[PDB]
Amino acid sequence: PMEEEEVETFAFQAEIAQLMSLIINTFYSNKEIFLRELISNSSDALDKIRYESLTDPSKLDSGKELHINLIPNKQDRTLTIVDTGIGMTKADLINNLGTIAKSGTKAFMEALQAGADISMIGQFGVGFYSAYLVAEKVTVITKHNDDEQYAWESSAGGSFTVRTDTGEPMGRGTKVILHLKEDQTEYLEERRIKEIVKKHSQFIGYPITLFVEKE
Numbered sequence: 130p131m132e133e134e135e136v137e138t139f140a141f142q143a144e145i146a147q148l149m150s151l152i153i154n155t156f157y158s159n160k161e162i163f164l165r166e167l168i169s170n171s172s173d174a175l176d177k178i179r180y181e182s183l184t185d186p187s188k189l190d191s192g193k194e195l196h197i198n199l200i201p202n203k204q205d206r207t208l209t210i211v212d213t214g215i216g217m218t219k220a221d222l223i224n225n226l227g228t229i230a231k232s233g234t235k236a237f238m239e240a241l242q243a244g245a246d247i248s249m250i251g252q253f254g255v256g257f258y259s260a261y262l263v264a265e266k267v268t269v270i271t272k273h274n275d276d277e278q279y280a281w282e283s284s285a286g287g288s289f290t291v292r293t294d295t296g297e298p299m300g301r302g303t304k305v306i307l308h309l310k311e312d313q314t315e316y317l318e319e320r321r322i323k324e325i326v327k328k329h330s331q332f333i334g335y336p337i338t339l340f341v342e343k344e
């Protein structure tokens with residue numbers, strides 16, 4: 130029987146859209162820092178569930194294990210980063226990942242057009258958008274306690290969508306799926322992933338596991 134699914138389409142806040150075009154359409158060396166930003170975001174969300182569980186242990190009913198998995202797929206050309214952090218409500222996605230102005234956006238674009246290296250992005254509070262250095266499309270699947278699982282998606286161009294996710298259930302957390310650009314397939318290679326995690330994400334306070342499919 131035919132299933133029906135509600136979708137909502139949103140416009141990025143004007144300077145966020147400007148930042149995304151600047152990230153996509155300008156050449157930057159040091160694109161590898163996208164992964165540091167993703168891991169640091171997962172780490173922050175894991176911190177939130179960890180401390181929030183000291184008050185209310187039943188917040189870990191949706192899974193006790195606090196960790197980060199990296200999953201390259203050479204046939205899909207995707208790299209997926211999964212955490213079991215606190216997750217995002219529907220309103221969190223809509224607000225935190227596109228519609229609400231971020232106070233650091235302008236400063237960052239100014240710094241970057243004066244020659245700052247792209248690695249500075251995290252300090253400006255817009256580090257998520259570094260995903261578009263390497264990815265043509267980003268999907269963020271998320272599950273927060275007491276809310277449904279949602280899917281956010283954007284290929285930039287000024288909009289994003291949000292929908293209730295009817296895919297594979299997660300207990301709690303956030304899964305980011307990077308559909309990589311054709312010239313950025315190095316970030317599917319075991320050695321390269323291990324290299325940049327070692328260089329940039331060495332002191333993360335949760336275990337990270339890299340899952341590699343048999344060649």
Ligand SMILES: CC(=O)c1ccc(NC(=O)c2cn[nH]c2-c2cc(Cl)c(O)cc2O)cc1
Binds near residue numbers: 175212216
């Ligand atoms: C705009 C920006 O850079 C940004 C960075 C991180 C967040 N994180 C969250 O809101 C959050 C809350 N729970 N889980 C997350 C989360 C978000 C992202 Cl984008 C991620 O990659 C991993 C997460 O755990 C939101 C915005």
